């Protein structure tokens, strides 16, 4: 499929902990997407596996609600409880159960042992959605945010912090991942996290409004 390249434009910041802080500058260290990075734009009309290199930032600027769910793991053709996520207009049922599913994941609008069966509110409802997945100490963390982009040309400027939704209690050896498609096209961005140091800014309402990447240029090192 077609590959393009796009500046990340200071995007992909998440809340590092579940503690309310207000009117303070806080310096944290986690696995962050670096500022002004080189993310890859994929146009799907057509599919080898994509690496999971210390975490993946995921974004989509699609209004028609076509991109639906992910699979994570190493082999992804049975043999291992890997992941499964389905997000229709009904609930958002996440499974670890493998499926032995084909290499062209199309959905029709016409398995084995099981671990996790979560049911929650619909994730997907000018609807840019950002996701961050990471794997530290056998834990799978998912952060998400919906952003009403006005001009749909590229990844927009500004700041939008990412809030956690689901913390899966187990996951082992995630190195590859894929996506799924819906047919009766798809376009998404993939960026890679990296252990950077950030200086977070909290307003009076506790909302992250600005950040400084301490290893970008010498001016930001001075600011940090």
């Amino acid at each position: 499929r077609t590959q393009s390249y796009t500046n990340s434009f200071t995007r992909g910041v998440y809340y590092p902990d579940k503690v309310f802080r207000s009117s303070v500058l806080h310096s944290t260290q986690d696995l962050f997407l670096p500022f002004f990075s080189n993310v890859t734009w994929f146009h799907a009309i057509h599919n080898p596996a994509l690496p999971f290199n210390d975490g993946v930032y995921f974004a989509s600027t699609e209004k028609s609600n076509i991109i639906r769910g992910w699979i994570f793991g190493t082999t992804l053709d049975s043999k291992t409880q890997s992941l499964l996520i389905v997000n229709n207009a009904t609930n958002v049922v996440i499974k670890v159960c493998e499926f032995q599913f084909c290499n062209d994941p199309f959905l029709d609008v016409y398995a084995n042992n099981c671990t996790f069966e979560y049911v929650s509110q619909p994730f997907l409802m000018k609807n840019l959605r950002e996701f961050v997945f990471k794997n530290i100490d056998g834990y799978f963390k998912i952060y998400s945010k919906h952003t009403p982009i006005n001009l749909e040309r590229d990844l927009p400027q500004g700041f939008s912090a990412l809030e956690p939704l689901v913390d899966l209690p187990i996951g082992i050896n995630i190195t590859r991942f894929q996506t799924l498609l819906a047919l009766h096209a798809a376009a998404y961005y993939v960026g890679y996290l990296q252990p950077r140091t950030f200086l977070l800014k909290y307003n009076e309402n506790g909302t992250i409004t600005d950040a400084v990447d301490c290893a970008l240029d010498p001016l930001s090192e001075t600011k940090c």
Partner: protein
């Protein structure tokens, strides 16, 4: 009935479980699924008496 893994290709991360049993090779000649020369199954019993 109690087994343990002798050796792996690399180290183990914390709270990481390994289930798949593949015949390890420590040489240039491939094992090809046969436990012959320079091919050892990693799972060996404790042998409790």
């Amino acid at each position: 009935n109690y087994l343990y893994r002798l050796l792996r290709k690399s180290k183990l991360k914390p709270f990481e479980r390994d289930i798949s049993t593949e015949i390890y090779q420590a040489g240039n000649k491939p094992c090809n699924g046969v436990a012959g020369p320079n091919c050892y199954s990693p799972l060996q019993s404790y042998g409790f008496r």
